[PDB]
């Protein structure tokens, strides 16, 4: 089962949302495709998960994108790995992966054009949303 999304006075919270875009200075830029994040990867998804547990009755929306390239249908659960990478992280660094929320939404939001691979690079970026 589902527990009813109503929220009386949860979900409107610190601006967490300005605060993660703080650190990571907007969407989160990935290099690596085919394999996981080595150590060493951003210390920006541990700070991001610090205000995350701050407020722990907030609800996260990570979203992820991808090229317009590719196979539509296939993007969905692709920008939902992409997404779910970030949760992995949260949850390790102790935010509750049951408030935390990862969607694939493929091509939706093109930040550059996908005439250019680089473009490209861009779109299939992730990015962090507060409820």
């Known amino acids: ?34 394999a996981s994040l080595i150590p060493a990867d951003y210390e920006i998804l541990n ?9 722990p009755d907030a609800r996260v929306t990570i979203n992820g994108y991808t ?19 970030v949760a992995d992280y949260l949850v390790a660094r102790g935010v509750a992966g049951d408030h935390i929320a990862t969607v694939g939404l493929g091509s939706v939001n093109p930040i550059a054009s996908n005439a250019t691979p680089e473009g490209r690079a861009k779109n299939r970026r992730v990015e962090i949303v507060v409820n």
């Open 1 to 34: 089962g589902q527990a009813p999304p109503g929220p009386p006075a949860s979900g409107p919270c610190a601006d967490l949302q300005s605060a993660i875009n703080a650190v990571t200075g907007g969407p989160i830029a990935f290099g690596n495709d085919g």
């Open 47 to 55: 700070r991001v998960a610090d205000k995350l547990k701050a407020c």
């Open 67 to 85: 090229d317009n390239t590719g196979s539509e249908g296939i993007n969905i659960p692709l920008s939902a790995q992409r997404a779910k990478i």
